[PDB]
């Protein structure tokens, strides 16, 4: 199921054209709303008085059809940045005219070209239109991977084509897009229709569009090959690009005329369907994570807040995770109790933050498989989850499990633990205050006792994503700092983004913390080599944790525990995008800060330019103790 549209520049009759397009299998049709050669004059008599009608009637389609089937196209003669003043004026008037007709019709999107470097005045007219009534309509900027000037045949005897590599030059059209959207102040209504040519540029040129709001990909029929049987197909490289674009669920647009005239015209489209059907389905994870892509979430604070029933349900729907815990507990029981002692030596296990019970059951299954004896305490401060636990205890666990409704930092334990087990980690490892909670529980761990997890490490990586930057930006709220949304992290299944350098470790914590002077504050400086031209928008955060020995949990991409669903990445934004050139280093600084009531992070970029210090004094974001 690819969603696809036909691009035409010639529509003799709307009804007949729409029918033909639908019968061929397309979902929509990009077409002119005025005749593309019907140049109009607004200033000079006599032509300005040309009798109407100026175009085709809105009565030719139903409102539903204008609203869902039609994408409008700016006439090709409209040149708001022409060097001829008169042409700039007529063009502005004509641009407003066609855009207003599109809004008049309720069209769901409108196509405008970026076919040259200077589109200042076009951006100004579009921005003016956008601030003329609040509307949901989208503007698709039609921009090529490769500028026409850079793909022309080498047939001009006295102007040869460049044959030397121009690294930044081959990215010029990304610059056209970036300047245009900067001028238009990152309007959410402005997206990319990326046009693909017969020859693809270097990978770095393609990767420049990573993290950009690509809504559509335009495939001219001329880029298709012909297989033995005569049917249009794509080169393996183009197929690679299509697959990458299907992962962004863009809409595909077929432009140009039918050049495989032996075959009919749904053929180009059937090939796309064929590619879509050929790729690996949802591998458990991606099945689960597709709905969450780039969806910003407040990070849970299970200490300060009492988690809802269904939130625990999400935790519990990850068997790979708990069986990692089971294996960690198992190995530990064996290391601690020799075989000769298997009937005399009962180990005291405390689950610290037991929620609805999954670690309790993992502990019990671990002891069985280890053939060792354990006495269990299930500690949980959330009294609503304590209800689930005490029904479990009465119905199933029996006296082997003691449920303790208490904060682990205040509970006066009646004995000491051989093993404390806990799941206090966030997506940034320590951002739920797992260190503070385990510190306060430590006094009741035996002198030789084991904490599972034994340690964890957060990781950071700079990223580019104009899409995510705009999503954060849109999180302004009525009665707070108008910039506070940039001074707080988000849990998000990062999807439309470009990772700019390999993740590097940030903060690490070990338990038990034998050290006589415990300080959980932290100050870390990271240097990220960046080998691309790009724009920095924030830092992705992940974590790894050692449960026991070689049994680990990880959401860091290069060591992601395979098959584990729990924990999306976290995102630290920065207020202002920072331009980064190939070969530069991104230097970021992260602090973990605390007082007796709250812990928080602050962060700052210091190379290649400085940002502001983000979240000073926790003013935008704190984690409650």
């Amino acid at each position: 199921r690819v969603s696809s549209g036909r691009d035409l520049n010639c529509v003799p009759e709307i009804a007949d054209t729409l029918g033909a397009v639908a019968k061929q299998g397309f979902d929509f049709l990009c077409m002119p709303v005025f005749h593309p050669r019907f140049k109009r004059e607004f200033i000079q008599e006599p032509a300005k008085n040309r009798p109407g009608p100026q175009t085709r009637s809105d009565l030719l389609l139903s409102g539903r059809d204008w609203n869902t089937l039609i994408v409008g196209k700016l006439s090709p003669w409209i040149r708001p940045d022409s060097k001829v003043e008169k042409i700039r004026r007529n063009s502005e008037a004509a641009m407003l005219q066609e855009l207003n007709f599109g809004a008049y019709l309720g069209l769901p999107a409108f196509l405008l070209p970026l076919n040259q470097e200077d589109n200042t005045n076009l951006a100004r007219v579009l921005t003016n239109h956008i601030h003329t009534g609040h509307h949901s309509s989208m503007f698709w900027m039609r921009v090529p991977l490769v500028a026409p000037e850079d793909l022309r045949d080498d047939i001009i005897e006295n102007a040869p084509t460049t044959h030397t590599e121009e690294y930044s030059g081959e990215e010029k059209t990304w610059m056209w897009w970036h300047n245009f959207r900067t001028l238009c102040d990152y309007s959410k209504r402005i997206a990319v229709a990326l046009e693909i040519g017969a020859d693809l540029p270097s990978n770095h040129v393609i990767d420049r569009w990573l993290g950009e709001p690509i809504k559509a990909a335009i495939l001219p029929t001329s880029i298709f090959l012909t297989n033995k049987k005569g049917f249009p197909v794509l080169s393996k490289m183009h197929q690679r690009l299509i697959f990458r674009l299907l992962k962004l669920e863009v809409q595909f647009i077929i432009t140009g005329t039918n050049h495989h005239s032996e075959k009919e015209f749904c053929s180009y489209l059937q090939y796309l369907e064929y590619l879509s059907q050929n790729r690996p389905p949802p591998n458990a994870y991606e099945l689960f994570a597709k709905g969450y892509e780039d969806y910003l979430q407040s990070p849970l604070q299970p200490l300060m807040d009492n988690l809802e029933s269904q939130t625990y349900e999400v935790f519990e729907k990850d068997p790979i995770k708990y069986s990692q815990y089971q294996q960690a507990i198992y190995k530990c029981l064996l290391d601690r109790v020799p075989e000769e002692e298997k009937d005399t030596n009962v180990q005291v296990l405390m689950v610290l933050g037991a929620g609805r019970g999954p670690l309790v059951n993992a502990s019990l299954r671990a002891a069985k498989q280890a053939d060792r004896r354990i006495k269990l305490y299930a500690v949980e401060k959330n009294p609503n989850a304590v209800v689930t636990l005490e029904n479990w205890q009465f119905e199933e666990w029996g006296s082997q499990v003691t449920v303790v409704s208490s904060d682990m930092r205040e509970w006066v334990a009646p004995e000491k633990a051989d093993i404390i087990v806990s799941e206090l980690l966030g997506s940034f490892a320590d951002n739920e205050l797992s260190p503070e909670c385990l510190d306060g529980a430590q006094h009741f761990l035996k002198d030789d006792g084991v904490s599972i997890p034994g340690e964890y490490t957060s990781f950071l990586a700079p990223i580019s994503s104009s899409k995510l930057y705009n999503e954060v930006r849109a999180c302004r709220e009525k009665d707070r700092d108008p910039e506070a949304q940039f001074e707080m992290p988000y849990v998000v299944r990062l999807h439309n983004f470009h990772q700019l350098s390999a993740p590097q470790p940030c903060f690490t914590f070990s338990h038990p913390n034998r050290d006589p002077m415990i300080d959980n504050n932290r100050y870390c400086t990271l240097e990220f080599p960046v080998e691309v031209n790009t724009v920095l928008h924030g830092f992705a955060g992940y974590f790894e944790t050692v449960l026991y020995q070689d049994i680990t949990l990880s959401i860091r991409p290069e060591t992601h525990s395979p098959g584990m669903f729990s924990w999306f990445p976290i995102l630290f934004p920065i207020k202002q995008p920072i331009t980064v050139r190939e070969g530069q280093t991104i230097c970021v600084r992260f602090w973990r800060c605390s007082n007796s009531k709250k812990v928080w992070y602050e962060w700052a970029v210091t190379a290649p330019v400085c940002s502001a210090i983000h979240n000073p004094t926790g003013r935008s974001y704190t984690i409650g103790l």
């Binding site: 010639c10 003799p12 593309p36 019907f38 100026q54 175009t55 500028a147 047939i155 001009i156 005329t257």
Partner: protein, 302 residues
Amino acid sequence: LPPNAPACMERQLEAARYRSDGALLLGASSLSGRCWAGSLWLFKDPCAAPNEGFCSAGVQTEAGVADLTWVGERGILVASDSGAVELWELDENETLIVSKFCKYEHDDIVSTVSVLSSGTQAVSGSKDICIKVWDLAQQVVLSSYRAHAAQVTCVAASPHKDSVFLSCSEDNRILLWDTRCPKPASQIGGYLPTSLAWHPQQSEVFVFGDENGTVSLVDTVLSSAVHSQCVTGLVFSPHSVPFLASLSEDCSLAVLDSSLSELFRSQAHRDFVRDATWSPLNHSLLTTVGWDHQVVHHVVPT
């Protein structure tokens, strides 16, 4: 009201060309309203044009007529809104215009078309930025050239050199083509060029107009600000020492002499002037057509 001839001709007249005997060919587009189509018309009496009931022949096309040109005495070569180049032909009786071939080789509107010296090949330019060379008898593209980087505004075949033609484009290039050369295009040394006319009596001399109203005379430079808007077309007259007709979106026609000085001006038109064609029979009569649906017959003082 001859057979298979539409009762009504479309408003926007795009092309007017006399043939040898003086029958007038018309091309029209409907550029607004419900149906965006086109039509082709022959008036053996040009003073009856554009009245449909008194035409010699006519026919509807599927899309609009962006450009056309005679092929010989009975052939009509059409640049279509649909990306097609079409060849139509008059019957032996010259009472029906019949489609000969319609090939969809361009990927956007075909904007300009020009028959080369021999009469057996034509060149077309399009908004798809390509120029194609056609073998009219085999109904096939012989070469496709992507020399330009923006829409191809005009192509003009050399008057006597079958491998030579000009083109200009919104990429601000004027290209001289000679397909005898390995790299066939050459860049001839502003405001965007919009129209081209070879000199009929001097091999290596041409005139071109620009989007700012200027006309220029060029050898393989002389210029005048003739128009207040885009120069849409340039047509040398048939005289031994030719006059130069120029037309513009400013709705005027000018007639210029050897040094680009103005000898005549007409403002008869009330909308864009789209073509001009000189009578073979009466060399001082010059016929224009425009989007105001007028066919005007100017008598140019000589």
